[PDB]
Nucleic acid binder design. Structure first.
Lengths: 44, 53, 110, 116, 120
RNA sequence: UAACGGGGCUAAGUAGUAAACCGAAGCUGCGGCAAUACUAGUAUUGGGUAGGGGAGCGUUCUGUAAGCGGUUGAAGGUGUGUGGUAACGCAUGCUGGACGUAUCAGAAGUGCGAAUGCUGACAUGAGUAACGAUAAAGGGGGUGAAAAACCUCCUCGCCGGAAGACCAAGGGUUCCUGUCCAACGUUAAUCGGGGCAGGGUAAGUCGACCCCUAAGGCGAGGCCGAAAGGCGUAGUCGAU
RNA sequence: AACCGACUAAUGUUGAAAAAUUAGCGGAUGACUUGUGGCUAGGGGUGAAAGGCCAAUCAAACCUGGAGAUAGCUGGUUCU
RNA sequence: GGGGAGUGAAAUAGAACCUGAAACCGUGUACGUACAAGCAGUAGGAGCAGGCUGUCCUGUGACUGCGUACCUUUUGUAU
RNA sequence: GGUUAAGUGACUAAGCGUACACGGUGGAUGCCUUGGCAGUCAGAGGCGAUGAAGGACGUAUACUUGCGAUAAGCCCAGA
């Protein structure tokens, strides 16, 4: 049965990637939040 | 489908009263003196005093 | 003279191993060895190795003869249990216990 | 200050468990069952300390009745006889006498008969 | 109920059993002694000992029969050239089962089965 | 049975008379404790839920205490003896191996059996169900501590618009070799997509990069909007 | 036939599987089906319309915060 | 994996390592238990076995009487 | 003394129970703490295009720390 995760790298990057996060105010808020939390991985 | 009360150790033990193991029927080969399952060849290949393997 | 061998952390359920221990408890060493030799039990092979280590220990670490030797004490004790996860149907997971056992044999010339 | 409960918590549990020595199964091993068990044992022990006094007196009366009737008088008539004879020997003693000194019992019976 | 019935299923289809026994007979003719499970040995006698009887009379018919039952030309030749001649006088009991303990892996009761009067 | 509690009863039923006895944690006797009155003795009183009131036990921490006890054995653990109405106290054998702490005060994360409580451990079911397509195995030999499962040989069977061979994606060393078999592998395993070590990916032409653009994204200025921003030109990105 | 689908039955229901398998069944040049990439986002989207679907969730997603909402209810509430 | 040997004050301090409780599981010993009906105890009580020396102590407990857990919630729960 | 009869009756434990002993499992408790928590008194109250915060990848005869192809460093001055 087709399950929900049908990964493509390009779609992962364009949605959740660093340059995508950095493009928007609220994305930067996420990166800053994760950077404050101490998260090793800021982006996907 | 399932118990309404955990079974005591006693009753568990009572069930396993028949769980004891019984030993194999052995015999000793005449020639080789090797113990073996009665009716079966020895490890050295004798059966009733003759080398058969 | 007593000699004790142990097999700690033996991968065998104590309940399984104990059936074979019951077969050779109180028996002579020669009698025990044949009982274990023609066993079809996995437990019998683990137990046979311990008993042989015990006999060796009496012959070497003590001064003794296999001839004058009895399974003085034998017992299996519950070892640590490795826990593991088995998937069941409908996304449910069950735990599997990989029981282990500590097999002790004592042999004695008395 | 923070108080850890361990050491005292165990002492309570152990006290009960020690009182539950000899009970079957959980009732001597497991605190939750043992506690219930040791409580009911105390309840029974209270009730029975009373009822001991009843059971023993029934036994005596049964024995005195046996002995009196061997000496040809009912328990009921014998007690009346003794009362009328002003003999104030308790049932516990009478029943002791009926077993251990049959002759004395017969004397008392003869005294009792005379009073009736 | 199985009253008076013969033949073990051996937890197999018929076509498999037929294949298995044809193979096993070929092995036994070739090697003259074969270790199998004891129930398979006992069934094998009902397959091999009839092949040996057939091989006592040498004919194109009988060789073809043996070939039909074995589909092995080496076996058929050994049957008619060696085993028949050997067992010419013998009235049955061409094989012998010797029980041989248990298999390690599954503690299956095992047995050797061999031809009688092996030159070896 | 099953409309005496049963046995059984013709009185062991019903009514009555006489004199007995049994019978409760009631009353009495004997010993003890407590509450409240009175004057240590009297007198009365002491079932109890919600609830009110009173008095305590023990725990951690502070002072007392740089005191007191402790490797000639602290705490903790586990027995035993003993004391009190109780919470509990005291002593002590063994274990243990360095703390403990009187007394009187002081302060609380101060007492657990319940909350389909929370965490960990360990039971019961139970050596039970099951071991994942009914395509199928049989045998000889090998290696090994051990071979149904690994290697090898001969047979058999199964797929064959696939159960073959490639590619993209996706994954990321799973590839090859040696070695190991604890765990992993629904069994064993000498084997493995497992562990460990070493090796292995060679481009003008394949692909990416690159030139080009689609949908669409972003978007100098701009237009619009409390702010954040939205839209959008020139552009610049964006393959399928 | 492939492919897409999902009408019946049986199995399965602590599954081989959080929707399948087996035997049958419908469509099969079209309002078809499929890959890649785009766009629409929560009182919002999208809907050949079932309140269907919007990550195994939907008469208002999910996450975090207000937040220990509130709970005239239920449970539980530890020594003598 | 273990037994010796050795180390150490200690090895039931041996790396699955201070202490090492309980649940739970074993081995050994004593006593009971295969004609016996239910909250498993209690009051009584024989016998047997250990001590100490039998109007003692300890363990077990044939047999007899009595006896439907706990909590909660309720007018009321063995329920 | 024997036989018979009648009565009576120990000795079984497959297993199980209780108690005790010695263990296993387990990791409570106690003791301990290189970590936390709440403050007081001071300091400093910013860092960044002279490229930050934070990272990637490297760097010595896997990861952490340091460093940056001058790479667990180079130079200089004090100590």
């Amino acid at each position: 049965m087709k399950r929900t995760f049908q990964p493509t790298v390009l779609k992962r990057k364009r949605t959740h990637g660093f340059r995508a996060r950095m493009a928007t105010k609220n994305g930067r808020k996420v990166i800053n939040a994760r950077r404050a939390k101490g998260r090793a991985r800021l982006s996907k | 489908a399932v118990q309404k009360n955990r079974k005591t150790r006693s009753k568990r033990g009572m069930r396993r009263s028949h769980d004891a193991l019984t030993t194999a029927a052995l015999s000793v080969d005449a020639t080789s003196g090797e113990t073996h399952l009665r009716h079966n060849v020895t490890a050295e290949g004798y059966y009733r005093g003759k080398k058969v393997i | 003279m007593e000699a004790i061998a142990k097999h700690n952390f033996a991968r065998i359920s104590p309940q399984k191993a104990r059936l074979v221990a019951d077969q050779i408890r109180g028996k002579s060493v020669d009698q025990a060895l044949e009982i274990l030799t023609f066993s079809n039990k996995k437990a019998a092979e683990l137990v046979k190795k311990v008993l042989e280590s015990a006999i060796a220990n009496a012959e070497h670490n003590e001064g003794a003869d296999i001839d004058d030797l009895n399974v003085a004490k034998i017992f299996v004790d519950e070892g640590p249990t490795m826990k593991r996860i088995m998937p069941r149907a409908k996304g449910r997971a069950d735990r599997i216990l990989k029981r282990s056992s500590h097999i002790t044999v004592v042999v004695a010339d008395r | 200050p923070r108080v850890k409960r361990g050491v005292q918590a165990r002492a309570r549990h152990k006290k009960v468990l020690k009182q539950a020595k000899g009970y079957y199964g959980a009732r001597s091993r497991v605190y939750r069952v043992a506690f219930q068990a040791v409580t009911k044992a105390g309840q029974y022990a209270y009730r029975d300390r009373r009822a001991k006094k009843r059971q023993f007196r029934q036994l005596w009366i049964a024995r005195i009745n046996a002995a009196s009737r061997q000496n040809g008088l009912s328990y009921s008539r014998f007690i009346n006889g003794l009362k009328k004879a002003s003999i104030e020997i308790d049932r516990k003693i009478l029943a002791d006498i009926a077993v251990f000194d049959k002759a004395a019992f017969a004397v008392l019976v003869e005294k009792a008969k005379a009073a009736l | 109920m199985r009253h008076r019935k013969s033949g073990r299923q051996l937890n197999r289809n018929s076509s498999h059993r037929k294949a298995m026994f044809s193979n096993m007979a070929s092995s036994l003719v070739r090697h003259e002694v074969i270790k199998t499970t004891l129930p398979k040995a006992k069934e094998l006698r009902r397959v091999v000992e009839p092949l040996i009887t057939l091989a006592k009379t040498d004919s194109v018919a009988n060789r073809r029969l043996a070939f039909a039952r074995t589909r092995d030309n080496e076996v058929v030749a050994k049957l008619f050239n060696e085993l028949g001649p050997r067992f010419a006088a013998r009235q049955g009991g061409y094989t012998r089962i010797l029980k041989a303990g248990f298999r390690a892996g599954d503690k299956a009761p095992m047995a050797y089965i061999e031809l009688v009067d092996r030159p070896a």
